[PDB]
Amino acid sequence: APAPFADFAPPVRPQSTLRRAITAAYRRPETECLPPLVEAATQSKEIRDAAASTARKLIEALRGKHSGSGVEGLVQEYSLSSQEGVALMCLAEALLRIPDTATRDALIRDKIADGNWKSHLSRSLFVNAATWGLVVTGKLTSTVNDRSLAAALTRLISRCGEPVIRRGVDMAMRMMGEQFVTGETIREALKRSKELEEKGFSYSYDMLGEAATTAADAERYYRDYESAIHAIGKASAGRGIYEGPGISIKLSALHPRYSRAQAARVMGELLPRVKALALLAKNYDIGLNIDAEEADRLELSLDLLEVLCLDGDLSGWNGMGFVVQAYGKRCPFVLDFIIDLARRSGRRIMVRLVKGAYWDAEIKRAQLDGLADFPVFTRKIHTDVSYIACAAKLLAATDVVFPQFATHNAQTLAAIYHMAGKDFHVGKYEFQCLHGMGEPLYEEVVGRGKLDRPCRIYAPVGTHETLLAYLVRRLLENGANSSFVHRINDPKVSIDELIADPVEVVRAMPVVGAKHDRIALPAELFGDARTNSAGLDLSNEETLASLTEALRESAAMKWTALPQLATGPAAGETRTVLNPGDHRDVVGSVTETSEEDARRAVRLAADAAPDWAAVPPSERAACLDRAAELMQARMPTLLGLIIREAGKSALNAIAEVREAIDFLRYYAEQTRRTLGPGHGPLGPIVCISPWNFPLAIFTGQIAAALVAGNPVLAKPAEETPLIAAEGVRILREAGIPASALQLLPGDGRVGAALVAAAETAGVMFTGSTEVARLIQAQLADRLSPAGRPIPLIAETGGQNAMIVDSSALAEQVVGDVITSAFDSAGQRCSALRVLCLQEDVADRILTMLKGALHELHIGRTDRLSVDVGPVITSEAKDNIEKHIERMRGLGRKVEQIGLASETGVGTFVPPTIIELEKLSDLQREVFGPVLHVIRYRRDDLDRLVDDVNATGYGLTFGLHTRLDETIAHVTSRIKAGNLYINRNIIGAVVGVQPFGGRGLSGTGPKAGGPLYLGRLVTTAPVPPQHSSVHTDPVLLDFAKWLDGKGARAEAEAARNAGSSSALGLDLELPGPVGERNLYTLHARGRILLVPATESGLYHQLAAALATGNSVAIDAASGLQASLKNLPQTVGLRVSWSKDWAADGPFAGALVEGDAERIRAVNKAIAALPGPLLLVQAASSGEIARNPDAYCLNWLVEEVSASINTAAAGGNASLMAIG
Ligand SMILES: Cc1cc2nc3c(=O)[nH]c(=O)nc-3n(C[C@H](O)[C@H](O)[C@H](O)COP(=O)(O)OP(=O)(O)OC[C@H]3O[C@@H](n4cnc5c(N)ncnc54)[C@H](O)[C@@H]3O)c2cc1C
Ligand SMILES: NC(=O)c1ccc[n+]([C@@H]2O[C@H](COP(=O)([O-])OP(=O)(O)OC[C@H]3O[C@@H](n4cnc5c(N)ncnc54)[C@H](O)[C@@H]3O)[C@@H](O)[C@H]2O)c1
Ligand SMILES: O=C(O)[C@@H]1C[C@@H](O)CN1
Ligand SMILES: [Mg+2]
Known part of the structure; x- marks a missing residue:
């Protein structure tokens, strides 16, 4: 038997002094990072004046040639609103999915222009409207108001006809074929690169792959890179790594488990693939650059860079390149390591200095994980100073590395241009920019008539599907309020403001390097209320x-x-x-x-x-x-x-x-x-x-x-x-x-x-x-x-479902499904049990899901590399396996991971996917790693929500969609206590997603919520924020009825219950950025009333109606004559029950009587089938004495909803934080 934790997480290699200095800086306080960067970035007054003059000249040229964009001119010509412009581009996108030009043109002319576009174009037209919204408005809206866009599209077509459709199609075709990418294919991109190469530019092609989900995905991205290297190398034709083109790759594209937790698989399986691509780049003598991704992958990628640079099979070639992100606190220490590696290996490493593309994601991740600090700066000016400081380090080492300064910021550019001084030769260093974005700036840099410095264009290559997948993240690089490109287009921003020196501005600040005021450290997420718990960084x-x-x-x-x-x-x-x-x-x-x-x-x-x-x-x-x-x-x-x-x-x-x-x-x-x-x-x-x-x-x-x-x-x-x-x-x-x-x-x-x-x-x-x-x-x-x-x-238990429509991003869905279903071997009460896939996307998602399944590592959990551990007992194992085999015996498709022999000493069940015909094929909660999958037609969505509700459970529920109409429909009709939109359905956080379900899933009140403690005392306090200005209208009708009947005291008690009810409470709870966490009080449902007296019945009814409920009244009370001539509104909520078990399920009960009547009723209530009922009882005298005889806390139902507002690829609120 292996000793516990003897192989928990050994590093790839012993950590050198230089590697340890990197790790030490991971989350260093921001005030500590900045002073040495200020020192390193300092330049002479003469240079600062010269740099400001150069920056002003560049910016004056940029603003002097700046024309209106095509989309702006389109909006202007046809007087489009923002929503119309977005809807038009979505229509154009959809029309361009028709490959044949004649067919598309006939559809436009004969069908689209002449009325109903809906009849002709399973997949909402508006799936990518968040992206087009950024293009049209410059603002990110996380979900799509598809009813607003449908109205706008009908309006604009009926107003403007074929000409506006034609113009939209041509605009989208140009943007998606020539602007967001250099070309659809590497051959097309290479053809279009000749023009600017003749002017002195060079190219590095971005094949737009990332985040492989399956082995098959990784193999596809690999063969795409390999084929691109051949085309680029053939075209390079001996020009070499500086004049000639190169390729950029993302390591996350080349393995589905690229992470520190899977470091052994990364070095054994990912590294040989990179080596094979590098060998091919070496033979053609082209650059091969490793792009930088999330912060928790930085140090892992260094282990690949080290092995490749020491590998003698790659000797003789200086084309290996590597990105470092200046918004990261480790950047100068990473550069020290790379420069030393270049010296040791003798490889002149091509180092692309960037600022960084994942900022808002890094803020959210550190907050979610409760970590000590962020791995990135939180003020944009700090990233600028970091960039310039790291440029000084790189410029001192041009004999051993090739610095590549990727930036669209003319101030940053000018500072480095003068920092580099007078001596230049091609191969000493270069600038870089993004295709379709940086050329206006760098046409003022490249060439003997300008600054005579080269620029390499980072050129995306891919189809419409490929470029749209993460286009939002790319748009935010240059489109946020603090972005240079956004500010140069803002007429309210002066050139003096744009040429401000970040080094001297930071130096003159009161507290050098202070954290942004508007970004909370993870420990301070809840402010003065309480201190957040702290986690641990398992990438450190x-x-x-x-x-x-x-x-x-x-x-x-x-x-x-x-x-x-x-x-x-x-x-x-x-x-x-x-x-x-x-x-x-x-x-x-x-x-x-x-x-x-x-x-x-x-x-x-x-x-x-x-x-x-x-x-x-x-x-x-x-x-x-x-x-x-x-x-x-x-x-x-x-x-x-x-x-x-x-x-x-x-x-x-x-x-x-x-x-x-x-x-x-x-x-x-x-x-x-x-x-x-x-x-x-x-x-x-x-x-x-x-x-x-x-x-x-x-x-x-x-x-x-x-x-x-x-x-x-x-x-x-x-x-x-x-x-x-x-x-x-x-x-x-x-x-x-x-x-x-x-x-x-x-x-x-x-x-x-x-x-x-x-x-x-x-x-x-x-x-x-x-x-x-x-x-x-x-x-x-x-x-x-x-x-x-x-x-x-x-x-109690759950039968938790996730509904996915054709607007969801498969890669996001699959990650959330794998986590929700198989985390903890499915032994969370919140775990995903039933995945519901819209028919049009079901086979594609299922294939990806099965591929991701087989990448899970199951075993004893004292190893960091283990994803799924054992089930708790042999009895649990036998119970789960019996279910699986029953399903298999019925002919259901069953997908299972193979288990390693080492699992035999414990009790393991392999993660399992079972394809069901209907939701009713499931009978009980199966508390293990067993995901059930059903398919549904989009028109049957409402019936599907019925089917989910029909299990009687109501614990956690997930929805993946971009479409507001679908969010509104599904979340209003689902009956569950914890809803999750565009994220996983597990790991509810105390005080952020108060946790607890309804029906067979719980009595409430919610653990981790504000009603909980009040259940544990004899007289409940008023929770914080617990009130509502809304009054139930049926309660009001009942109070008026009571006054009409002469029951003046009961009418007053009814009005008091209407005011005291917190039904309609609707709050947002503080939590991490990039998420909206909502807490609402709803009716529980149908409350069983067991009255003894007329006054008692009226008080019970007032309590139930004030909290939004319907009632079933015990017919054996003999009180039917007390409710004659009710208003129809109240009558709709009232039923009489002789056989309580036939008229359920109920969501609670109110009982009146003496002690032995209460005991008798309580026994009869406990015998009702289905959910446990939260019962409240009072004597007739208690009802007369105590206005709170029945507590209204327990007659409402808490609902928590957590919405991932970053799901579109960025955080709109953080676009304003710099
Ligand atoms: C050729 C090229 C290659 C690139 N390769 C990569 C890559 O492999 N990996 C990668 O991560 N990105 C990459 N980028 C993107 C780059 O990192 C920047 O995100 C982007 O280019 C904008 O930076 P800037 O200098 O152009 O403009 P700027 O407007 O000067 O800088 C914008 C940047 O400031 C930073 N920032 C914004 N707000 C804050 C804040 N509140 N606190 C701290 N920092 C903030 C962000 O990094 C943001 O992107 C590349 C860019 C180019 C042009
Ligand atoms: N809604 C939630 O918040 C939530 C959270 C976690 C787990 N769960 C549910 O818990 C179940 C799995 O956990 P479990 O296997 O420990 O549940 P369990 O019902 O088998 O046992 C839970 C506890 O009840 C005790 N128990 C068993 N019989 C009892 C009896 N006759 N009288 C009094 N106590 C008795 C057990 O010793 C144990 O301490 C799942 O159904 C899961 O969905 C619900
Ligand atoms: O949602 C989850 O998985 C856990 C279990 C409950 O305690 C709430 N938090
Ligand atoms: Mg048990």
Whole structure:
């Protein structure tokens, strides 16, 4: 048996002094990066004056030849609105998908121009409207208002006819064939390059591949590069690497798992492919440049650059090139490494200095990951100073490297032109620019009549489909408010402003290098409310080295879990806890609780309840905050335990510990916002938790109950007692008294013994719906000492769907599907179970999905390279496999990864894709790595949403579409608690996506949300921000009816319920950039009313209607005559039920009666099929005395919606931040 973590994440090679200096700068504070860059970028006053003069001359030339764009002239000629211009370009794009010119022209003339375009053109015309919106308006709108565009297109065609369609088609043809690309094919691009090569320009061709999803994709990009190198080398015809053309490649195009976590596969499989392309470039003697991509790929790419430059088979050729990004904090240290590598190898490395193309994505990623700082600067001027400083370094090393200064900024250009001084020869250095963007500037640079410096044009090559895929990211490079190209086109920007010297501006700032004011550090995402949890950068070699040792040390510890009663640990039956990925690996030992001691623990909790309730709320919250600090400090050790006990990967263990820290801090802050003397605790609360989030959900339930003033009996899942015991140790260290928090390890009958104990005042359950139903039945024969039902929070299973239409980007979909379905071996309650693909795109996405499936690494999770770990037990494995084989036996197509022999020592299920005929083929939640796929016709979308709802579950739900009409339709009709738009459906974040479902998926209130603590006290406080100015109109009609009947007091109570209801609350919660996180209060559905008196019925109806609900009223109440002559609006919401089980499912219940009536009704309600119902009961006298006898918190339904607003390829809000 391999030693735990002995091979967790060894680096590709020992890290040199130069490599370590790179890693040390990864997230260095911005104030620390800038001073040395200012120093390096400083130039003489004479040079600065000369540079400003040169920059002014260039800018005066640029503004002097600047004409209106073709799209602007089109909009002007036909008086188009912005939406019409966008709609026109989308139509033109669609018409150009018709390959035959005569056919297209006939369609335009005979069909498109003469009325209905809809009849003639499965795929919305407006799939790429966000891109065309950037072209027309200069502004990025993340999703497409396709109803507005359809109206605009009808309007413009009916107004202007064939001539405007013709002009749009010709414009789009020119832009997509000659501007966004140099040519559709490498041969076409080469033909069109002669003109500017004759003027002194050169070329590097960008074949536009990136982000391979499958082996087949990577092979396709490889053969595309190979064929392009032949065409370029044939055309180069011996011109060499400086005068002649070259190619640029992206390493992410050449392997589907290009990442540090897969470093071994990258060096074994990706590196030989790059070497083969480099060998071909060497034979033709052309440049081959490695483009720079995301920050977490920088250092990995250095290992490829190193091997290639040391490889003797490539000797004699100086064409190997490499991009470094000046917006990155590591840039000068990366250059030091490259310059030294060039010296050692004797290869004159071609170094393209750029600023960087992924800025807004890097901001979002660091925030999501809770990392210490950003790997890029946050003020644009800092990137400018960094660029100039790094140019000074490169210009001092032209004997060993070939600097290539890629920029469209005339100030940057001028500064470097004068920095380089008087001596020049071709081959010393060059400038670079983008095709269709930089030529106006560089036609003032190239040539003996200008500055006589060469410029290499980066020339995209590809079809319409290929160029549109990431055109948004390219547009933002030069189209943001801080971009030079955007500013030179802004008449409100003066030339004096444009020639401002970034070096001297930064030098004169009060705090040199300060972070941008409007960008939050990840730790400060929530501002004054609470401190964000911190993650770990698994791309950072120092972090991986430190984590390796902490994880190894964690595996040497003798972890135990004992029954920790108030009086001390108790004796019991002891057994080992085994690693689910390798049963030979003993993680620790658990002593499980006898049923006698579980009953004893509840009595001790009851005796201790007054002492814990008397700890003031702020001090209880301080315990939670101290516990969060302790978990943050101990995260590395906690990771190792979760990895080995629960079969989790390192990434998932980090997220798990982060969620625990976030629960502690969120419930502490919510406590400080709400809890006072009148919010009395329930009493002893039994917290029963599942194995699959063995620290986060465990901690969340306990922390909430404790901080609300309740002593807790913690019963962790039998599979995962060790991390639970450590959580309890931490909470006790943080100041939770032993009498307030008792740990009772064991199985379901320890849980049941706790639930059944006479002093149990509340139950918090997360687990399967079947077990929650058994707990519900147990509690149905129970009343509190005050004669009211024992509160139960029961958060249960899901049958989670994702709907994908033909507007979604397949690569994005597949990544989100692979993550949502197979992360944690599908053992998240949020996991994607049913993928629903629009028929027109289903086969293409399915092929990509299966290809991505086979790139997953399954194994014991103490290796960073493992993507999917084991299932938790052999019983879980057998249950999942039985489902798979049943499906296979029915003839359903089944796709499965092959498992390595090493998995035999643990319990593994291979990630599996099962193609279903209809959603009804699924009967129960299958809690494993099993994705089901169904197909749907676009016209049947509404029926499909019905089918998803018809399972009765309602936990997580995903939608991939660009189309506002589809977003509005689907999100209004789906019934689920957590919605996700254009992103994955897992990893809901505390206080950002409050988590919890409806129907068979939960009772609520949501964990990680503002209603949670109020369920754990006898009188609920008013949550922060919890109110609504909207009044339900049926409630109003009912109040008027009551006044008409003479029931004046009930009418007043109804109006009060209408005002007090928070139905219609609609909030945006603070979170990361590039995401909109929404929280809304809706009706629950149909509420079962069990009244006893006429006044009681009126109060129950007022409560239910004020919260937007319909009702079913118990016909056995005999109160039919109390509701005569209702207004039709109210009658529509009212039904009478003799057979409650026939008229469900309900979403809650209100009960009136004495204690034994309540107990009887509670038993009958628990026996209803389907969802657990959140029941509220009151006596007739309570209804008369207490306006809040029925609490309106529990009659609304919380919905969380998380929208990825960066999905179109950039962040509109961050285009204004520089
Ligand atoms: C020939 C060529 C090759 C290129 N190759 C690559 C490549 O392989 N990898 C790559 O990542 N990109 C590449 N780029 C893009 C380049 O990195 C820039 O994104 C783009 O060209 C605009 O920079 P600029 O000097 O032209 O103009 P500018 O307007 O001077 O600079 C714009 C840049 O400033 C930076 N910036 C904007 N806002 C902020 C902020 N708030 N904080 C910090 N920095 C900010 C961004 O990097 C932005 O792109 C290439 C560009 C060219 C012309
Ligand atoms: N909605 C959510 O937030 C959420 C979160 C995570 C998991 N889940 C659900 O949890 C399920 C998987 O987790 P699990 O396998 O640990 O669930 P489970 O139902 O098998 O057990 C959960 C806990 O209940 C206890 N238990 C079993 N029988 C009991 C009984 N008769 N009385 C009292 N307690 C009893 C168990 O010991 C365990 O601590 C899945 O259905 C998943 O969807 C839901
Ligand atoms: O959404 C998810 O996957 C996790 C599980 C719940 O605790 C909420 N956060
Ligand atoms: Mg179980």
